[PDB]
A paper describes a structure:
Each protein contains tandem N-terminal bromodomains, termed BD1 (closer to the N-terminus) and BD2 (closer to the C-terminus), making a total of eight bromodomains in the BET family. Focusing on the key amino acid differences between the BD1 and BD2 KAc binding sites highlights acidic Asp144 in BRD4 BD1, where the same amino acid in three-dimensional space is replaced with basic His437 in BRD4 BD2.
As with benzimidazole 14, the pyridone group of 31 acted as the KAc mimetic, making the predicted hydrogen-bonding interactions directly to Asn140 and through water to Tyr97. The benzimidazole core occupies the ZA channel formed between Trp81 and Leu92, with the latter amino acid making a 3.8 Å CH-π interaction with the imidazole centroid. Demonstrating the design hypothesis, the basic piperidine (pKa: 9.6) interacts with Asp144 via a 3.0 Å salt bridge. Presumably, this clash between 31 and His433 contributes to the high levels of BD1 domain selectivity through the reduction of BD2 domain affinity. These efforts resulted in chemical probe 31 bearing a basic piperidine, which makes a direct salt bridge with Asp144 and clashes with His433, driving high levels of BD1 domain selectivity (300–1000-fold depending on protein and assay format) across the BET bromodomain family.
Residue numbers in the entry: 43 to 167
The structure:
């Protein structure tokens, strides 16, 4: 079976808008979301549909851009570094689970290069 997806809203976790979090939604997520190579990252890994019974045996902190998009839109975060952490967890999980030579690793590497370019211009608080 699949685990429940990561939460994108929590009534007990303080949240706010920062111009940095607005930049992460309007520029960073926006740019990555409709990249040609975005689609494997737009939702949680469905280990049932893909027949990957070991995925959630290996990956215990799953993350995906669908979850991050909802967290940004739902105002889940307190600061930009929490969101940048989620992006990096998504990339790290991909590189840990998958093998060099896998199409998904090339796809992640293209998205990560673009991610790092956009994060490099995170605005002043
Ligand atoms: C393992 C995995 C799968 C997916 C995924 N989300 C999908 C949504 C819709 C339809 C298909 C989807 N897939 C399948 C991948 C899509 C890109 C290309 N893929 C590969 O390169 C294989 C190569 C072989 N490897 C090995 C480790 C079994 C597994 C990956 C196959 C996403 N993420 C983040 C993953 O880490």
């Amino acid at each position: 079976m699949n685990p429940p997806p990561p939460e994108t809203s929590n009534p007990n976790k303080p949240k706010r808008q920062t111009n940095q979090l607005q930049y992460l939604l309007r520029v960073v997520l926006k740019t990555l979301w409709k990249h040609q190579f975005a689609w494997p990252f737009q939702q949680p890994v469905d280990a049932v549909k893909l027949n990957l019974p070991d995925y959630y045996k290996i990956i215990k902190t799953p993350m995906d851009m669908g979850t991050i998009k909802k967290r940004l839109e739902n105002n889940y975060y307190w600061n930009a570094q929490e969101c940048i952490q989620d992006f990096n967890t998504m990339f790290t999980n991909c590189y840990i689970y998958n093998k060099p030579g896998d199409d998904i690793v090339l796809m992640a590497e293209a998205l990560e290069k673009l991610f790092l370019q956009k994060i490099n211009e995170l605005p002043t608080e």
